[PDB]
Structure 1
Amino acid sequence: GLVASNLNLKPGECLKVRGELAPDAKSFVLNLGKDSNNLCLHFNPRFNAHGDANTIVCNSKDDGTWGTEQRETAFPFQPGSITEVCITFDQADLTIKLPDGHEFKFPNRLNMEAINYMAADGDFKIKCVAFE
């Protein structure tokens, strides 16, 4: 999966990620934080994996150890198609904005004020990445 560092997202900025889901997508990932072991956001929508179907699982990682899981019922994704996710942030929390219109929030537990790391994983092939 594609890894990008140094991208310094400051509060208020919007990171748009666009890509295509594999035809038999089981799940894909999007990690944001300071480094691979310090993620303020772990965006793991699961079509079918770990005992979960059509459910988005969010979390944070501190020095390698996971935090409390927060699950979202909304799931506007389909295998073998192209989608995008818009993510914004501030001291409060991050705001994930799904392609189907609605968005939900996830608390900025690690309390960081600058995303610098990003990593995609799973059955998701990135085609575009914008910083608006």
Structure 2
Amino acid sequence: ACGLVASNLNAKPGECLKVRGELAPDAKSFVLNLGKDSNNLCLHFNPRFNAHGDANTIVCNSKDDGTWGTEQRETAFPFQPGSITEVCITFDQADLTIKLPDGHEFKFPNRLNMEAINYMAADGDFKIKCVAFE
């Protein structure tokens, strides 16, 4: 139900998205989205504690005119229910780089070579403490 949605960003390559949130003690999933609008996402970042058949797996994807792209799963899962977590994301026209709080990083392709991000959303089983993209 509850969530954060912002359509008033003006983020560009070289800037860093930093999101901090407090994970519910029974957290099943949370989502961070970046893009142009809800139907056009260069990144959907979805740690699944236990959701949609995945356990302790991050699912990433893109969304183009409402259509989900090819999923990319990551096994690094430094997320503890009931605690604060921080995720940082940088990007350029080739890839987004996701930096997890244990020092794991991975790339997700910038499939539509998006160079301006004006939309973000954060929702699921956590309460927001910080969103910065600067």
TM-score by length of 1: 0.97
Which consecutive residues of structure 2, in runs of 5 or more, have no partner in the other structure?
none
Deviations 1:69-121 (A, max 9, x none): 00001100010110110010001100010011121000000211111100011
> Helix, strand or coil: the match of 1:9?
coil
Between Structure 1 and Structure 2, the one with more strand by share is 1
In structure 2, what is the equivalent of residue 112 of structure 1?
Answer: 114
1:15 is matched with which residue? 17
Whole-angstrom distance in 1 between the partners of 2:124 and 2:78: 17
Provide the identity percentage.
Answer: 99
- State the Cα deviation string for residues 5-59 of structure 1 (Å, max 9, x = none): 1211111110111110011000000000000000000000100011110000000
Moved >4 Å (runs of 4+): none
Distance 2:70 2:132 in 1: 29
How many residue pairs align between the two structures?
Answer: 132
1:128 positional shift? 1.1
User: What are the ranges of 5 or more consecutive residues in structure 1 without an aligned counterpart?
Assistant: none
Q: Is the 8 A contact 1:29 1:124 kept in 2?
A: no
TM-score (ref. length: structure 2) = 0.96
**SS in structure 2 of the partner of residue 96 of structure 1:** strand
